[PDB]
């Protein structure tokens, strides 16, 4: 799973972030603290058919605002865009949540956008926490 994320601010300046290169390793979670307010996320996700990803936004206190699932269907490369909530201060992607939600032990990588990659596993409780905060 390789995600190309274009975060767009209010005046249309785009910030591109490329999540995974090209760690043919499996499930990951990605967290991004916004350096500025964004209004739109344009994504292109390189994966496999029938994969599902979760994109979650949290406010400045780190609390859940909302999430969307990205469903691949017959497409291995899934493209589209998502509105970013007014109060969003963070984004998170759970990649292939179709796997990790039932097997949270299959997640071995957390990408923190400006504080580096962390190699770790998650039990059911640690995984659930990442969905909510």
Which CATH number is 65's domain given? 2.60.120.1150
Distance separating alpha carbons of residues 5 and 108, to the nearest angstrom: 21
How many domains does one find in the chain? 1
Structural domain boundaries enclosing 40: 1-133
E-only strand ranges, 23-89: 27-33, 40-46, 52-58, 64-71, 77-83
Specified resolution (Å): 2.2
Q: Shortest CA distance to 16 belongs to which of 39, 42, 35?
A: 42
Q: Is 4 exposed, middle or buried (0-12, 13-18, 19+ CB in 10 A)?
A: middle
Residue 15 to residue 8: CA distance in whole angstroms: 6
Handedness of CA 97, 99, 101, 107 (dihedral sign): negative
Phi, psi for 128 (deg, rounded to 5): -55, -40
Chain centroid to CA 102: how far?
Answer: 18
């Amino acid at each position: 799973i390789v995600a190309n994320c274009e975060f767009v601010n209010a005046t249309g300046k785009k910030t591109t972030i490329l999540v995974n290169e090209n760690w043919a390793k499996y499930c990951w979670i990605w967290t991004y603290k916004f350096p500025e307010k964004y209004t739109l996320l344009r994504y292109s996700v390189d994966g496999e058919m029938f994969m599902r990803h979760r994109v979650t936004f949290f406010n400045a206190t780190g609390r859940y605002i909302t999430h969307t699932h990205l469903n691949h269907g017959l497409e291995d490369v899934l493209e589209g865009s998502l509105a970013v909530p007014k109060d969003a201060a963070y984004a998170r992607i759970h990649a292939a949540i179709n796997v990790s939600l039932t097997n949270p032990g299959d997640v071995h990588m957390h990408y923190d956008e400006t504080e580096g990659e962390q190699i770790r596993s998650y039990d059911a409780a640690e995984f659930a926490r990442t969905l909510a905060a």
